[PDB]
């Protein structure tokens, strides 16, 4: 039947829209997780090198 | 008074209120009026550890020779003394700073002598 095929089309269209929305969501999720992890790694070179340099400052002064 | 000069060259101290609104200029007397539990000692140590003059704004460059601290302590109680000593030794200023320490248990007449033989 026509509406046999049309309800099959509706199920396929809702599944395809569902998975496209899920693709956009998963891409934004891996984007935000990678941005947070790289903000971590960018902050850690500051948080470690500043400690190392201040240690050499006070060691040289001592 | 004929042989004085105008205290004229901008010290930035890092503290935003002192840098923007109540400027500390090199050659000035300005006391920190504090209360009884307020952190006066930490503000004094912060101005000790980061006060610099910026000559690029001034227009000269010409060097960066840093400050020499003279710390004249009259009757502090080994807690404030330990904070000042630990701060100056972590920043490394003790190779430029003389400390006339008169602790609290030491007798209460040589507090007259202390600021004169510091200045």
Rounded CA-CA distance A27/A29 in Å is 5
What is the dihedral sign for C-alpha A31, A36, A39, A41?
negative
What is the least distance, in Å, from the CA of A43 to any CA of chain B?
23
Rounded CA-CA distance B4/B110 in Å is 31
Per the structure, the count of domains in chain A is: 1
- List residues in chain A touching B: CB distance below 8 A: 57-58, 60-62
**Contact between A60 and B94 using a beta-carbon 8 Å cutoff:** no
A44: containing domain: 1-62
Q: What is the CATH number of the domain that holds A53?
A: 1.20.5.620
The technique is: cryo-EM
Q: Which residues on adjacent β-strands are paired with residue B100?
A: B72
| Angle, in degrees to the nearest 10, between helices A2-61 and B79-91 | 100
Data resolution in angstroms: 3.8
């Amino acid at each position: 039947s026509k509406l046999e095929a049309i309800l099959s089309q509706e199920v396929e269209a809702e599944i395809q829209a569902l998975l496209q929305e899920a693709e956009a969501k998963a891409e934004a999720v891996k984007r935000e997780a990678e941005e947070k992890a790289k903000a971590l790694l960018q902050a850690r070179e500051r948080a470690l090198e500043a400690q190392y340099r201040a240690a050499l400052r006070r060691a040289e002064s001592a | 008074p004929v042989a004085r000069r105008k205290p004229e060259q901008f010290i930035q101290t890092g503290i935003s209120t002192i840098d923007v609104m109540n400027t500390l200029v090199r050659g000035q007397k300005l006391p920190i009026f504090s209360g009884s539990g307020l952190p006066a000692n930490e503000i004094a140590a912060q101005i000790a550890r980061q006060a610099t003059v910026r000559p690029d704004l001034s227009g000269e460059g010409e060097k960066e020779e840093p400050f020499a601290v003279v710390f004249a302590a009259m009757g502090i109680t080994q807690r404030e003394l330990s904070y000042f000593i630990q701060e100056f030794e972590r920043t490394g200023a003790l190779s430029r700073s003389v400390l006339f320490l008169n602790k609290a248990d030491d007798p209460t007449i040589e507090r007259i002598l202390t600021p004169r033989m510091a200045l």
